[PDB]
Amino acid sequence: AQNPNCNIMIFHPTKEEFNDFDKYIAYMESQGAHRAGLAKIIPPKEWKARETYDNISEILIATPLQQVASGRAGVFTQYHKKKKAMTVGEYRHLANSKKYQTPPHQNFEDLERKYWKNRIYNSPIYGADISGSLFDENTKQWNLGHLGTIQDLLEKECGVVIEGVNTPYLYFGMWKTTFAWHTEDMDLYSINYLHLGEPKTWYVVPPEHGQRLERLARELFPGSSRGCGAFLRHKVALISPTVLKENGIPFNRITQEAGEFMVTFPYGYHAGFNHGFNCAEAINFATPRWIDYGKMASQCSCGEARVTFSMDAFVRILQPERYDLWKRGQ
Ligand SMILES: [NH3+]NC(=O)CCCc1nn[nH]n1
């Protein structure tokens, strides 16, 4: 059995290996990468996403979100407070201001320590889920806007055409910007490219151990749990590595730097934070191996988790017994 300890694996594909995306995902899985829930992919030296990032400042962040915490340093929720629009240039300036800039620090571990110690006492602002792409149209390899769609995967595996589209999203982050513990919608894969700026630290629970995290989460956020049987899909709960370790939860951590891809695997819970101003691009995707995860994915039907158009078809086809309840929640 490959990668039995579920370690995060790091890959260095050659330019030839970088041609066929699906083939490389399958290769990583042949090596046990999925057991971790997350893998890093360092592109070959010959590859670039686009020529420069000199011309990005006029992108609009129509609804920046201020992430306001409640709870305790290691066990907290965050709510997103809507802010007035601003451009990416304006946002970069804000991220670099004295109020929001990354403190002095010795290394990634010192900064991680500062994050967990102090995150709750600040409310960073971020740009999330902005439809768009920063890949040049002439980038043929690992262009997140040119992957096979999940609708086409489903049609190829199961035989039925469905409505829906699948496009990438941009994220503009700053110091302490946080992504809460979650799996993807319908336990899909995600791919994630860090275009520019400071790192993003990730935490991940092996898929085979995801229920352990769910059990702990229900214990640590009891009101939330009573509210919804799948409340982690609300994407608001944070649990620190110290707390996870105290509770015996299997996990791993890694830091992504500019120019690196991260793949999350079906049912791999993940969370993390940004070190400073950055821009990332992400999209969900599927493979044949996903289908059985999609059929078994939990769903939030309490109403809090988000209206999702492309999701409808996935629930309708893969989870017909749950469909009507899920839809009432939409
Ligand atoms: N699935 N990918 C993730 O959950 C991380 C997405 C990129 C991100 N960066 N800050 N919040 N989100």
Ligand SMILES: [Cl-]
């Ligand atoms: Cl700090």
Ligand code: NI
């Ligand atoms: Ni995610």
Ligand SMILES: [Zn+2]
């Ligand atoms: Zn819910």
